[PDB]
Every structure is written in structure tokens, then in C-alpha cells.
Amino acid sequence: NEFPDQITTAEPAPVLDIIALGTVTGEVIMFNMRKGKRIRTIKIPQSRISSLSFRTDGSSHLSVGTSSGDLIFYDLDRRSRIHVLKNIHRESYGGVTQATFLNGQPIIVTSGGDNSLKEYVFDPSLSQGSGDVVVQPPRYLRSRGGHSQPPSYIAFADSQSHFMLSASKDRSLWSFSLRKDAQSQEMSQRLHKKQDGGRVGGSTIKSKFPEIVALAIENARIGEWENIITAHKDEKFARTWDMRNKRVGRWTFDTTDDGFVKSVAMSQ
Amino acid sequence: IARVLAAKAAVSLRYDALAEDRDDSGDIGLESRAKVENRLSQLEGRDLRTT
């Protein structure tokens, strides 16, 4: 029959000939091809459903990935919501595009359009007698990730040609691997405390740094002190990091002339 | 509780020893009893064992 709104996503359920359909508005409709009918409908209003999947470990869960960034687990034996998951992938790049279960396995794999790819495991139940009514929230697990915007600067960390540093355009610095991609990790911008005994400089709220223009890199005394330095967009100083601890170093260097910094380098 | 009940005993005691118009109904007496009792409850309700 003619459906009232644009059914933008679909997935065939593991029960016999029912197919899950996701509308442009928030309605998951479960069509039954044998009876030519619908079985049930669930509503997630003012939100755009973007992917469907089904848990196949014997227990019955459904997973909606809605393109506001959110990911909901429905339970069909109770018509309930087990757990929501807010902002896996950012809404601006599309939100959660495809989020599947695995056949028999209680892990889901989610990927959006903002270059993230995470997997989420369901724990076994915590109450031994009741069991399937207290389901733990899904834990985080292994993930891989780029940085959603083309990188601005490229460096090679070691002489081994093993790790590279990418200074992105979404104001983020990443360390990528070359052998097998298990260790692509962001260098965290938690500033170390200033050594005087007093509190830190810069923003207390974790907003990211300015746009990162030009950096510099060597491996001469790694780990003993600050290794790489960089220069940001129209920022009056140029700040360092540490390659070993993978976070910001202590001392930013001002240019002491009231000018923007454009070209950093380091002695070998 | 011995310290807080001594303090409320001082309150009640010097009230009904120094007043000369009381009705001998024990009003601030059992009021101080209620205050000592929920003080006792809210100090025994703590558990210094880290849960």
C-alpha cells in the first residue's frame, strides 16, 4: 500500500519474511511480506531514521541509527527502549550512516560520515535470575578514526617510517600509523600545569585549539622533554607538544613582538 | 551524643529552673528530645567504611 512518508532505509529482519523500513520522519515500520501487512510500528519523532539492524544472538534487540547523531536500541519483547547513545557521529557530516549487528554476536559496528568507525559490545546481564530485563548499557570498544576534514600539514615522526603526524583542518592533531592501523590516535589537548605551583593557562572548557598552520618535528631527545612544536592560525605564540606522552607540553613560546607566528623549525 | 545531650540538658535545665511562668508540660523538653533524636539518627546513618 502507499506509505505516507518517504521510507528511506530498509533491512531484512531475521524472523521469517518481515522487513524493517525507516521513514524520512521517525517511524520504523515492520512490513510482513507473507501477509502483505505491517506487524508493528515504533516512533522516534522529529528525527531522521538512517539505519536499521537486528540482534541475532538468540535474544531480540533492534537498533535504530538516527541521523541526528543518535543510536537507539529497542527491545521488541517488551516494546521498550534498552538504551540510547547520544552523538556517536556528529550530525553535520550526516550522523550515523550505517550501524549493524553481527550475526550471532552481541557487538554492533557503527560508522558515520565523519570518518569514525566504532564498535560497541553489549555486556552479559548482571542479575543471574531475571537476566534479560536488566541489560547493561553498551560499552565502548575498538575504534578507528580520521578527522573529518582534509589535513593541513604532514610530518613523519621517526626515522623508521612508522608513525606520521597529521595536522588537520578541524583544529586537531593526530598520530597515524603506517604498518597496520591499530594505533591512529589523537594527541589530547589537556594542558600540563604551569610549573610555578599555580594553575594552568588557556581555556578550562575543552574547546579545541586554533587552526594549526605549520609544525616542526625531529627525534633527537625523545621523551626527555618536549619534542614537536607547532604554530597556529593567527595566534600570538607557538606551542609545543610531546610525541611520547601524546599531549601538549608545558611551555608555549611567545614571539615577543606582537605578531602572528608563521614559520617554526627545530635544531636537529 | 553525650556532648549534644549535655548541651540540650543545659538548655532545658536552665529554662525550667529559671522561668517563673511555665505550665510544666515539657514543651521545649520534648522538642529538644526530637532534635537530639534526629541528630543521633543523622550521625549514626553515616558509615565510615568506604562502600
Binding site: - | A7, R14, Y15, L18, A19
Partner: protein, 121 residues
Amino acid sequence: NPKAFPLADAALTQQILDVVQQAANLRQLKKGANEATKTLNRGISEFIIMAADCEPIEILLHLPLLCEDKNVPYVFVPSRVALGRACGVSRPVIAASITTNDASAIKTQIYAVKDKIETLL
């Protein structure tokens, strides 16, 4: 409040609360009714100020009796929350005794206040 014998006027209340503020600045007073009676029994108190604002007044008027036995000056003030904010404690105190130190820096205003208190009996 008929049993509240001598309670001060507006200007005398203001000047004794400023001198008890300076006493709390210099740490030369002991606050609270039971502490007041302790320092009165061990005989260090210059004078006693007491607040006629509590729901029994007999919680404080037991120290007038030994205060009259020991001839110390004593005076009431109509607000215990004023006593608290002037003594430097976030709770409304009742009584405050000012201890004796002849090597102070507020000795002359303490003694002028003491004369203004012992003059009204």
C-alpha cells in the same frame, strides 16, 4: 520581653557592636552562652553582651545571677542574628564575653563601653 532587663538603645547598641566587631578582629572574645559562663566562672570577662531575641530568654538569663555575684557588667541587645554577624560566625550566637587583656589595641574603647554599660545598672 519583660524579663529582658537592661537592653541598650540604638546608638549604644551600635557602638558596642562595633567594639565587639573589633574584638572579633583582634581575637579577644569568647562567644556562646556556655563559653560565656565558663569564662565568667574562671573570671576573665570584661563584660557580657546577651541577645534578647531567643524563644526562651531563660537559656541565657542564668548567667546574670553569677554575673551579679561577680559584679561584672552585662547588657542585652535585641538581635541574636546581629550578634552573629557582628561576632563573625555564620550562626546566631546568644552571648559573648570579652576577655581581659590590658596590652590590647582597643583597651580604651572597651573601657569606655564598659563605663557606658555599668552606668545604667
